[PDB]
RNA sequence: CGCUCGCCGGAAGACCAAGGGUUCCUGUCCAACGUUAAUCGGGGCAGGGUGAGUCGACCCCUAAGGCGAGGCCGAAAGGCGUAGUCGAUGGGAAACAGGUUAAUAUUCCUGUACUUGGUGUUACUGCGAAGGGGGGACGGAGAAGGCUAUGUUGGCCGGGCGACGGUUGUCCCGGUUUAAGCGUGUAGGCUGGUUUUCCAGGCAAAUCCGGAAAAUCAAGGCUGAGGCGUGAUGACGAGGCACUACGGUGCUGAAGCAACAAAUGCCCUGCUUCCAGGAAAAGCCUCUAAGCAUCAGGUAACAUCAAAUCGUACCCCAAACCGACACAGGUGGUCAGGUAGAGAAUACCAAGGCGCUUGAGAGAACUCGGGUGAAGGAACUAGGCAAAAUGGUGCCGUAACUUCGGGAGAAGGCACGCUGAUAUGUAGGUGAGGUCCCUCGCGGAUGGAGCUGAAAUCAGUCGAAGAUACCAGCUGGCUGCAACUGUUUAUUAAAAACACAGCACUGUGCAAACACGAAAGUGGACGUAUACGGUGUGACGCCUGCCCGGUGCCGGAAGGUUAAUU
RNA sequence: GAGGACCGAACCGACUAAUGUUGAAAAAUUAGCGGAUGACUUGUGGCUGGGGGUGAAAGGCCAAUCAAACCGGGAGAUAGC
């Protein structure tokens, strides 16, 4: 049992993009920004508990942050974790 | 047999092989094999400490029984074999109880021969006894220097030792070097001579044949510069000095034995 | 023509990395020196 | 964007490791960067993009080597190393085909699979390791056979009837693809099998391995490419049809066979042969010990659950890596089509990729890179430097000398294209139907349809020339030096120098001499005088003379002299 | 079907010439050249450290540095020039 307090911290935001929208309307898969240290099992439990939908499978990847310039200053955005969450057929989010 | 190669190429003109159509053609006996990787003549400081060693063929180590202390149980020679680790051939022997061992192959030993060790073994080639029980005047090999330590003298192909005398607890031996040496009579020895006497008749024939054996080139000191070797230097071929090692010690007759601990056992030096 | 710098990350880290520096007293004195100088990058360790 | 032209194509194509790190895709901008302009960019800015039980890492296991509790050694710092613990470049489970994005895909989707482990039932049951045994597990070269990848031709299906003479045909163009998995067990490779009794071996035990003695049977087992079947009534598929936001989308879809040739890939970790004699440890199989006893544990079937985490974009013979540059340099692995060809050479092409980020004119000297040259032909020059020349295959033929192998491709010379016949395509290779047999199958024998196919001879014929291009030895005579193949002054010296097999002297009895080291130790060597070190000489042939006064080395020890000490 | 065998690509070299010499390049390009089953060549990783290593020996090589590497220190060495 993953504690609800942990489940409430692992989902960070929906991910909005053309690929995400196509995933939702073609494969019943929603795309999320998730905490960097979240596992697939944690993501699955959090989606099921908080969004109240049944999940088929979770795929994950780590996005490396870009180096950016700002007023001659060089910086680097943080890496983050993206989750493609496939829902069971018939579920709607 | 000693076979001269035909001169179909300059590198084969001078080659002389020792071909023995009795050695096993298959693989060695695996339970008595160990790996043995190469050193390049370098010690654990990683420094070259013996020059002219490197490369050559990969070799597995055969565990050879130099102690010959399995007394009272006969063994039969199963086959003779090539051993890359030494000049002599070895023989795989099967004991009555089902144990197999490797021994140095004496001259004349062939598959089917029987061997034995111990105080009551027969006086026959390949049998091992304490020298107390071997007749004076006999020819023996694989001679111990301390009882139970294992054979250490006359192990190379074709070598043997003569038991010349027996006085009290000691026997006197004529070694291959010509030295007369006292050894405890409780030390063991194997009857006969080490086989493969034709080993010294081979001719390598080309440089590569030495490279196959792990021997790297010798560079003459007189071919170097003075910073490298006492012999180096000279506008042209010059020498003008007493021959020395690379470290400066005379190398044409100066003696280097210094062992007062073992002096008491040398009846007569080789010269 | 082959030049002198032929990069390998494993060799870089084994030769000059943080744990190699920590393995000897002389390497810990390199680190002490670079800290006293105030280097932003103490070692090659990426 | 289009049409044309040219260039690479064993790469200048495609794909990785390494290294780099957003360079990837889309929009937008042209200051600076880009050796020019730039509307373009690997440039600026913004947004997007990397989806795994099966690929890799992590992980289990070890090599060289590293570290190393105690330990041994050393003024200190430290050195070495035992038990151990790390360390890949090596050993260890499992996924394929098709479709899809602007950008990922063996990761997403469709279809069809597979592996390991945890639980829980059912049935049967001796399980148990830090120990024993097996296995893993290993070289070089060479030779075939059986195959596949792949190609070519025919058949089949669809389309065509030609910008200029001809083209309904023995004509032209295109396609003719299909995986892992599962089943079967073939060419081939290896091994006799089974059952009893006994035993100084495998640190104890062992039913396992090893050994000994009988009985009986003779075929039993292990391994194995390919093919065949299924996977697949599926997928893909030339083209056609309809819209386009003219970039491309949506629908449908024929044939989908055979013969021949054929690898450097597979059978093959095989086989034959040679000497220089060819890792380790775990996974895996098996044996028992202590111990546990209708318990645990094991075996099998079924069900269910789990297989986390990190990498995955993009460049990769390069404008993204190493070279200060968008630098004629360097960079390990994999793939390997057509015609000619021995070929991965070479020429022209395919797929695919490119015209090298200043151009426009002109048509002086001179420089660079090339082409041709009257007569002469080394007169040039230090020197034939450079250039010119030779150049293939088959056959004829080939001297001195020689260590009998060589020299030798010595030298020199002849033939060579195309067409027809021999022979509507030969010798040879391959091989279907049919027939016979069978211990009936992926079988044997016969049989030869079909396919493929040199080489030769005779006759004819075109050109100045038939190894026509690219490609592709110049040859001979005397002589110095080094025997030879090798090595060397990275960047002015490749040699006659170094090495070398062979030879000799000499040291070295093993705790070897010797070498690294205040030392412990380590190398020498798990070697032992037919061995190991040092030194000189340098294949081989015939040989290697005289001198021990000097210097050194070896032996001697009666005498002289002589240190600390007393 | 032997061989430090033979011809010859890849691969490893570097004998000659021209060019280049503020280079396309701080050692190359082009035409020729040698080895090409071996004393061969190559990837990954390891080991040897400065009077020290390694050296088929050229005082060669040890990061475009070698008759004693590089960096820091004694250090403002000393300099009848
Ligand atoms: Cu004295
Ligand atoms: K031997
Ligand atoms: K020499
Ligand atoms: K000299
Ligand atoms: K000299
Ligand atoms: K000289
Ligand atoms: K290093
Ligand atoms: K430029
Ligand atoms: K312009
Ligand atoms: K842009
Ligand atoms: K080790
Ligand atoms: K170790
Ligand atoms: K299961
Ligand atoms: K073999
Ligand atoms: K066809
Ligand atoms: K026409
Ligand atoms: K039998
Ligand atoms: K199949
Ligand atoms: K076991
Ligand atoms: K990818
Ligand atoms: K070409
Ligand atoms: K002009
Ligand atoms: K002009
Ligand atoms: K003719
Ligand atoms: K036929
Ligand atoms: K025929
Ligand atoms: K030729
Ligand atoms: K000579
Ligand atoms: K040369
Ligand atoms: K030399
Ligand atoms: K000697
Ligand atoms: K001779
Ligand atoms: K000779
Ligand atoms: K003399
Ligand atoms: K003398
Ligand atoms: K005296
Ligand atoms: K190697
Ligand atoms: K040196
Ligand atoms: K440096
Ligand atoms: K120095
Ligand atoms: Mg992932
Ligand atoms: Mg941050
Ligand atoms: Mg050490
Ligand atoms: Mg030597
Ligand atoms: Mg040896
Ligand atoms: Mg020698
Ligand atoms: Mg010299
Ligand atoms: Mg000197
Ligand atoms: Mg002279
Ligand atoms: Mg003189
Ligand atoms: Mg001296
Ligand atoms: Mg590398
Ligand atoms: Mg264009
Ligand atoms: Mg950028
Ligand atoms: Mg781009
Ligand atoms: Mg500009
Ligand atoms: Mg402008
Ligand atoms: Mg950009
Ligand atoms: Mg999935
Ligand atoms: Mg895998
Ligand atoms: Mg240690
Ligand atoms: Mg300690
Ligand atoms: Mg480990
Ligand atoms: Mg590995
Ligand atoms: Mg892509
Ligand atoms: Mg074992
Ligand atoms: Mg192996
Ligand atoms: Mg082999
Ligand atoms: Mg085929
Ligand atoms: Mg096929
Ligand atoms: Mg017409
Ligand atoms: Mg056709
Ligand atoms: Mg099929
Ligand atoms: Mg080959
Ligand atoms: Mg990719
Ligand atoms: Mg450019
Ligand atoms: Mg370049
Ligand atoms: Mg290369
Ligand atoms: Mg071709
Ligand atoms: Mg070519
Ligand atoms: Mg094309
Ligand atoms: Mg002109
Ligand atoms: Mg000119
Ligand atoms: Mg000309
Ligand atoms: Mg002329
Ligand atoms: Mg003319
Ligand atoms: Mg003329
Ligand atoms: Mg003439
Ligand atoms: Mg003249
Ligand atoms: Mg003149
Ligand atoms: Mg010339
Ligand atoms: Mg020419
Ligand atoms: Mg001649
Ligand atoms: Mg065929
Ligand atoms: Mg040419
Ligand atoms: Mg002369
Ligand atoms: Mg020579
Ligand atoms: Mg070299
Ligand atoms: Mg030079
Ligand atoms: Mg040169
Ligand atoms: Mg020792
Ligand atoms: Mg010692
Ligand atoms: Mg030792
Ligand atoms: Mg000489
Ligand atoms: Mg005298
Ligand atoms: Mg004396
Ligand atoms: Mg050769
Ligand atoms: Mg060189
Ligand atoms: Mg060249
Ligand atoms: Mg040659
Ligand atoms: Mg060649
Ligand atoms: Mg110093
Ligand atoms: Mg000199
Ligand atoms: Mg240098
Ligand atoms: Mg000095
Ligand atoms: Mg001072
Ligand atoms: Mg000063």
Author numbering:
A (entry chain s): 1 to 93
B (entry chain c): 2 to 272
C (entry chain 1): 1 to 46
Paper text:
Since the earliest biochemical studies on ribosomes, Mg2+ along with K+ and polyamines were found to be essential for the structure and function of these systems (1–8). However, such descriptions were hampered by poorly modelled ion binding sites as observed in a recent cryo-EM 1.55 Å Escherichia coli ribosome structure where incomplete ion assignments blurred our understanding of their binding patterns. We revisited this model to establish general binding principles applicable to any RNA of sufficient resolution. By applying these rules, we could assign all Mg2+ ions bound with 2–4 non-water oxygens.
